[PDB]
Write an enzyme that holds these catalytic residues in place. Structure first.
Site, PDB file in Angstrom:
ATOM      1  N   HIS A  35       9.169 -22.098 -36.794  1.00 50.04           N
ATOM      2  CA  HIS A  35       7.782 -21.773 -36.454  1.00 50.04           C
ATOM      3  C   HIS A  35       6.810 -21.970 -37.611  1.00 50.04           C
ATOM      4  CE1 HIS A  35      10.165 -19.932 -33.312  1.00 50.04           C
ATOM      5  NE2 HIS A  35       9.079 -19.746 -32.583  1.00 50.04           N
ATOM      6  N   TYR A  57       5.799 -12.756 -30.948  1.00 50.32           N
ATOM      7  CA  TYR A  57       7.151 -12.220 -30.792  1.00 50.32           C
ATOM      8  C   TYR A  57       7.245 -10.724 -31.099  1.00 50.32           C
ATOM      9  CZ  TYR A  57       8.204 -17.196 -30.522  1.00 50.32           C
ATOM     10  OH  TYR A  57       8.206 -18.531 -30.193  1.00 50.32           O
ATOM     11  N   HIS A 110      15.060 -16.753 -21.507  1.00 50.98           N
ATOM     12  CA  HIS A 110      13.801 -16.687 -22.244  1.00 50.98           C
ATOM     13  C   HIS A 110      12.910 -17.878 -21.891  1.00 50.98           C
ATOM     14  CE1 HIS A 110      10.939 -15.823 -25.498  1.00 50.98           C
ATOM     15  NE2 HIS A 110      10.928 -17.131 -25.679  1.00 50.98           N
ATOM     16  N   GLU A 111      13.475 -19.082 -21.966  1.00 52.68           N
ATOM     17  CA  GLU A 111      12.727 -20.305 -21.679  1.00 52.68           C
ATOM     18  C   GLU A 111      12.277 -20.365 -20.224  1.00 52.68           C
ATOM     19  OE1 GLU A 111      11.854 -21.640 -24.332  1.00 52.68           O
ATOM     20  OE2 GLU A 111      13.450 -20.796 -25.580  1.00 52.68           O
ATOM     21  N   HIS A 119      14.882 -27.088 -31.397  1.00 58.88           N
ATOM     22  CA  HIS A 119      14.426 -25.729 -31.115  1.00 58.88           C
ATOM     23  C   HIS A 119      13.952 -25.652 -29.667  1.00 58.88           C
ATOM     24  CE1 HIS A 119      13.003 -21.627 -32.140  1.00 58.88           C
ATOM     25  NE2 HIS A 119      12.196 -21.878 -31.125  1.00 58.88           N
ATOM     26  N   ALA A 120      14.568 -24.751 -28.905  1.00 61.27           N
ATOM     27  CA  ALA A 120      14.318 -24.607 -27.468  1.00 61.27           C
ATOM     28  C   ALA A 120      12.836 -24.415 -27.146  1.00 61.27           C
ATOM     29  CB  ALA A 120      15.140 -23.461 -26.904  1.00 61.27           C
ATOM     30  N   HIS A 123       9.080 -18.537 -19.526  1.00 61.60           N
ATOM     31  CA  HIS A 123       7.882 -19.340 -19.765  1.00 61.60           C
ATOM     32  C   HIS A 123       7.579 -20.189 -18.537  1.00 61.60           C
ATOM     33  CE1 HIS A 123       7.403 -18.178 -23.870  1.00 61.60           C
ATOM     34  NE2 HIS A 123       8.476 -18.806 -24.315  1.00 61.60           N
ATOM     35  N   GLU A 148       5.949 -14.535 -24.091  1.00 59.16           N
ATOM     36  CA  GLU A 148       7.261 -14.379 -24.729  1.00 59.16           C
ATOM     37  C   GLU A 148       8.104 -13.263 -24.109  1.00 59.16           C
ATOM     38  OE1 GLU A 148       8.151 -16.714 -26.580  1.00 59.16           O
ATOM     39  OE2 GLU A 148       6.152 -17.594 -26.789  1.00 59.16           O
TER      40      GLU A 148
HETATM   41  C1  LIG Z   1       3.012 -29.184 -26.306  1.00 59.43           C
HETATM   42  C2  LIG Z   1       3.661 -28.207 -25.327  1.00 59.43           C
HETATM   43  C3  LIG Z   1       4.145 -26.918 -26.011  1.00 59.43           C
HETATM   44  C4  LIG Z   1       5.559 -27.115 -26.569  1.00 59.43           C
HETATM   45  C5  LIG Z   1       4.127 -25.737 -25.033  1.00 59.43           C
HETATM   46  N1  LIG Z   1       2.809 -25.562 -24.392  1.00 59.43           N
HETATM   47  C6  LIG Z   1       2.621 -25.764 -23.087  1.00 59.43           C
HETATM   48  C7  LIG Z   1       1.204 -25.492 -22.579  1.00 59.43           C
HETATM   49  O1  LIG Z   1       3.491 -26.167 -22.317  1.00 59.43           O
HETATM   50  C8  LIG Z   1       4.471 -24.398 -25.708  1.00 59.43           C
HETATM   51  O2  LIG Z   1       3.737 -23.928 -26.578  1.00 59.43           O
HETATM   52  N2  LIG Z   1       5.559 -23.791 -25.218  1.00 59.43           N
HETATM   53  C9  LIG Z   1       6.057 -22.478 -25.676  1.00 59.43           C
HETATM   54  C10 LIG Z   1       6.066 -21.504 -24.504  1.00 59.43           C
HETATM   55  C11 LIG Z   1       4.615 -21.137 -24.153  1.00 59.43           C
HETATM   56  C12 LIG Z   1       3.833 -22.009 -23.394  1.00 59.43           C
HETATM   57  C13 LIG Z   1       2.511 -21.676 -23.088  1.00 59.43           C
HETATM   58  C14 LIG Z   1       1.964 -20.478 -23.547  1.00 59.43           C
HETATM   59  O3  LIG Z   1       0.672 -20.146 -23.243  1.00 59.43           O
HETATM   60  C15 LIG Z   1       2.745 -19.612 -24.314  1.00 59.43           C
HETATM   61  C16 LIG Z   1       4.068 -19.943 -24.617  1.00 59.43           C
HETATM   62  C17 LIG Z   1       7.449 -22.660 -26.285  1.00 59.43           C
HETATM   63  O4  LIG Z   1       8.152 -23.608 -25.933  1.00 59.43           O
HETATM   64  N3  LIG Z   1       7.785 -21.764 -27.218  1.00 59.43           N
HETATM   65  C18 LIG Z   1       9.036 -21.863 -27.988  1.00 59.43           C
HETATM   66  C19 LIG Z   1       8.664 -22.135 -29.464  1.00 59.43           C
HETATM   67  C20 LIG Z   1       7.667 -23.298 -29.593  1.00 59.43           C
HETATM   68  C21 LIG Z   1       6.284 -23.071 -29.552  1.00 59.43           C
HETATM   69  C22 LIG Z   1       5.391 -24.138 -29.654  1.00 59.43           C
HETATM   70  C23 LIG Z   1       5.885 -25.438 -29.804  1.00 59.43           C
HETATM   71  O5  LIG Z   1       5.033 -26.494 -29.911  1.00 59.43           O
HETATM   72  C24 LIG Z   1       7.261 -25.667 -29.839  1.00 59.43           C
HETATM   73  C25 LIG Z   1       8.146 -24.598 -29.732  1.00 59.43           C
HETATM   74  P1  LIG Z   1      10.050 -20.337 -27.791  1.00 59.43           P
HETATM   75  O6  LIG Z   1       9.269 -19.084 -27.974  1.00 59.43           O
HETATM   76  O7  LIG Z   1      10.700 -20.432 -26.350  1.00 59.43           O
HETATM   77  O8  LIG Z   1      11.237 -20.526 -28.894  1.00 59.43           O
HETATM   78 ZN   LIG Z   2       9.254 -18.343 -26.137  1.00 63.67          ZN
END
Ligand SMILES: CC[C@H](C)[C@H](NC(C)=O)C(=O)N[C@@H](Cc1ccc(O)cc1)C(=O)N[C@@H](Cc1ccc(O)cc1)P(=O)(O)O
Ligand SMILES: [Zn+2]
Ligand SMILES: *[C@@H]1O[C@H](CO)[C@@H](O[C@@H]2O[C@H](CO)[C@@H](O[C@@H]3O[C@H](CO[C@H]4O[C@H](CO)[C@@H](O)[C@H](O)[C@@H]4O)[C@@H](O)[C@H](O[C@H]4O[C@H](CO[C@@H]5O[C@H](CO)[C@@H](O)[C@H](O)[C@@H]5O)[C@@H](O)[C@H](O)[C@@H]4O)[C@@H]3O)[C@H](O)[C@H]2NC(C)=O)[C@H](O)[C@H]1NC(C)=O
Ligand SMILES: *[C@@H]1O[C@H](CO)[C@@H](O)[C@H](O)[C@H]1NC(C)=O
Ligand SMILES: *[C@@H]1O[C@H](CO)[C@@H](O)[C@H](O)[C@H]1NC(C)=O
Length: 598
Positions: A481, A491, A351-352, A321-322, A355, A379
């Site tokens: 999720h 979302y 989308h990615e 999952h991206a 972030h 998002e």
């Molecule tokens: C342990 C690291 C985490 C994977 C990361 N957090 C950070 C601080 O890098 C994180 O939550 N990243 C968010 C995108 C996001 C990042 C930060 C935010 O405040 C909000 C969103 C992200 O990748 N969301 C994805 C879904 C996801 C969300 C949380 C996860 O642990 C894994 C996947 P998307 O909506 O692109 O499908």
């Molecule tokens: Zn996202």
């Protein structure tokens, strides 16, 4: 005196923020190693670092009580201190936190390791969701094949983790209460800093719901013509396996069979992407180009060196999952995506990268402010870009859309295609959290947990499982999720506010004027617009330094989450669709589903 203490507190915060960034870096590195490479060793490592950081957080929350922070003059200092008092799961006793981490990785790893047997070859049992199962779900029009894969996946990704999910709900609730929230629902909702937030979303959803009913009705009508009335009834919920998505969250994959004008062009650039020799690398470089074109920040070298942009070809298990990752230093930001060369994947890349852009924009902020204004903002960023990339205007510029004539009918096709992704998603996203909130709040008896899920999917989306389910099954964790404990309301918020951002960005770019037929909102391209980029910079650079209405105000002068913009975008579709459903005597609404037995 409080004057001397407030000066001391400022210095305390500066040091602590930097310490938290550094400690989180270490946790994130271990989480990255596990996500990129699922093993028992990496699981153990990931969870032990987390347990360590949780322990430090406990000491931090305790240390805040030594400061009279509520008495301070500085709103900024008070805001930082408040953020530090909020422990989340780290409020749990040591043993309970370790147990929670073990349950969470049990669910995420289960989901990631799901493999099913080939429908045609019971010998070949190495088909994963991404890409094998999703390939079939998106492309097959064999309803029994579709139903086979649906059952196999939900049985393995959902039902298999019922007991773990039960324990997760228990510990999530225990954590929330230790932070003095009523439940995990309130803990999540706290991120939106607005005590009427649920009601606001109910009101916005109620306004858009009639348009969803019309789209639902028309899609069901068109599916009956394709599959016949033995497969799809006129008056019942749509069998979800026919909607081109494992969770029926977006329906664009079936646009070729449900499009308003089948003899007119329908945008699907996947074939042209493959013909032009597109690669994942090229797709990411193109995303980078879009951001820099708006005068926003270039992807740093660490991104290119450290990102995983293709599914690894060894035998390893990983989370596909991206996701986008902030390592909390300077310029160490990464994406992990099992990228494929498709139109939908091109939007996902953007989308990615949205972030990633947010990370780069606020990395100068103190640690506690290095996050979205609210989870919805984070998002929305990439999706604003994706909206313009999806336009015929943009796709012709990049040579992906050829010999396209944008007449009234082609416009309806494109609007409908967008709606299949944007309007359809709204009730889906709402139910993901309405469900979990109801469990967190203790509103559903454990005996009724599975049919409570399908009841909501029926009530809001008018979809149902392809086969009869019961309380012997447990289907919710089949959505990533839900297995991975990621809040979903973000979302729903995104899909509303992204249209506020898009509208305003288009107006600023001179790409939209409601009184000029040559500048429709649905063909706006913000590529190359420094004016649109300025608004983004003004908003994203703030991070969480201010309550989200202030961040919205920085973008476009508004302070209110509103469904006005999304309704404005789809208005020409609403008028056409209402008329088309009347013309074709299309049935609207659905009877209660018979697919979950109590
Ligand atoms: C342990 C690291 C985490 C994977 C990361 N957090 C950070 C601080 O890098 C994180 O939550 N990243 C968010 C995108 C996001 C990042 C930060 C935010 O405040 C909000 C969103 C992200 O990748 N969301 C994805 C879904 C996801 C969300 C949380 C996860 O642990 C894994 C996947 P998307 O909506 O692109 O499908
Ligand atoms: Zn996202
Ligand atoms: C979630 O809500 C919980 C409440 O439901 C809350 O738990 C409470 O936190 C309080 C800390 O803020 C705590 O209050 C202390 O109580 C001590 C004695 O309590 C005992 O008896 C209780 C029964 O009567 C038991 O239930 C407890 O378990 C205890 O055994 C007091 O000794 C203590 O006092 C000292 O501290 C205060 C500090 O307050 C401030 O201090 C500054 C000084 O710099 C003042 O200037 C300022 O005005 C202010 O008063 C001093 O005033 C005092 O002189 C003592 O030094 C204190 O009152 C309470 O016990 C605890 N539980 C309960 C059941 O009430 C959680 O903290 C909440 N969780 C989160 C995350 O927010
Ligand atoms: C995955 O982690 C294991 C340790 O569990 C390690 O030996 C191996 O090198 C890793 N694989 C890759 C491809 O990094
Ligand atoms: C690029 O951003 C800077 C500030 O970050 C801004 O001053 C400038 O206007 C932008 N570039 C252009 C061409 O406008």
């Amino acid at each position: 005196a409080l004057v001397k203490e407030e000066i001391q507190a400022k210095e305390y915060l500066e040091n602590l923020n930097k310490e938290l960034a550094k400690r989180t870096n270490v946790e994130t590195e271990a989480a990255w190693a596990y996500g990129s490479n699922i093993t028992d060793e990496n699981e153990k490592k990931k969870n032990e670092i987390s347990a360590e950081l949780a322990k430090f957080m406990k000491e931090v929350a305790s240390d805040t009580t030594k400061f009279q922070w509520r008495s301070y003059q500085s709103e900024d200092l008070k805001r930082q201190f408040k953020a530090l008092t909020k422990l989340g799961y780290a409020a749990l006793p040591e043993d309970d936190y370790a147990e929670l981490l073990d349950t969470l990785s049990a669910m995420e790893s289960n989901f990631a390791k799901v493999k099913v047997c080939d429908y045609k070859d019971s010998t070949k049992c190495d088909l994963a969701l991404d890409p094998e199962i999703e390939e079939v779900i998106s492309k097959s029009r064999d309803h029994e094949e579709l139903a086979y894969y649906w059952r196999e996946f939900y049985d393995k990704a959902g039902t298999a983790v019922r007991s773990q999910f039960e324990r997760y709900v228990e510990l999530n609730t225990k954590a929330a209460k230790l932070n003095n929230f009523t439940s995990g629902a309130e803990a999540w909702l706290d991120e939106y800093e607005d005590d009427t937030f649920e009601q606001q979303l109910e009101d916005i959803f109620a306004d858009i719901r009639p348009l969803y009913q019309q789209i639902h009705g028309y899609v069901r009508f068109r599916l009956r013509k394709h599959y016949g009335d033995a497969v799809v009834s006129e008056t019942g919920p749509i069998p979800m396996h026919l909607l081109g998505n494992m969770w029926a969250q977006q329906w664009s994959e079936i646009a070729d069979i449900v499009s308003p004008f089948p003899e007119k062009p329908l945008v699907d650039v996947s074939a042209e992407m493959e013909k032009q020799g597109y690669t994942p690398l090229k797709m990411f470089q193109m995303g980078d180009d879009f951001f820099t074109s708006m005068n926003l920040t270039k992807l740093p070298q660490d991104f290119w060196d450290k990102s995983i942009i293709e599914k690894p070809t060894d035998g390893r298990d990983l989370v596909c999952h991206a996701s986008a990752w902030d390592f909390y230093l300077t310029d160490d930001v990464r994406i992990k995506q099992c990228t494929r060369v498709t139109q939908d994947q091109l939007f996902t890349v953007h989308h990615e990268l949205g972030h990633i852009q947010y990370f780069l924009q606020y990395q100068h902020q103190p640690f506690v402010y290095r996050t979205g204004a609210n989870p919805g903002f984070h998002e929305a960023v990439g999706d604003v870009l994706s909206l313009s990339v999806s336009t015929p205007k943009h796709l012709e510029k990049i040579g992906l859309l050829k010999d396209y004539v944008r007449d009234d009918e082609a416009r309806i096709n494109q609007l409908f295609l967008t709606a299949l992704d944007k309007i359809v998603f709204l009730p889906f996203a709402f139910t993901m959290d309405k469900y979990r909130w109801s469990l967190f709040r203790g509103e559903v008896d454990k005996a009724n947990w599975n049919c409570a899920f399908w009841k909501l999917r029926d009530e809001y989306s008018g979809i149902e499982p392809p086969v009869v389910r019961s309380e012997k099954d447990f289907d919710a964790p089949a959505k990533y999720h839900i297995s991975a404990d990621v809040e979903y309301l973000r979302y729903l918020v995104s899909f509303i506010i992204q249209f506020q951002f898009y509208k305003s960005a288009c107006i600023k770019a001179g790409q939209y004027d409601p009184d000029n037929v040559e500048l429709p909102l649905d063909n706006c391209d913000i590529y190359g617009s420094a004016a649109a980029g300025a608004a983004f910079h003004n908003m994203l650079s703030m991070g969480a330094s201010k309550p989200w209405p202030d961040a919205l105000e920085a973008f476009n002068g508004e302070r209110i989450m509103s469904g006005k913009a999304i309704a404005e975008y789809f208005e020409p579709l609403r008028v056409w669709l209402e008329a088309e459903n009347i013309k074709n005597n299309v049935h609207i609404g659905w009877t209660t589903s018979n697919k979950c037995v109590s």
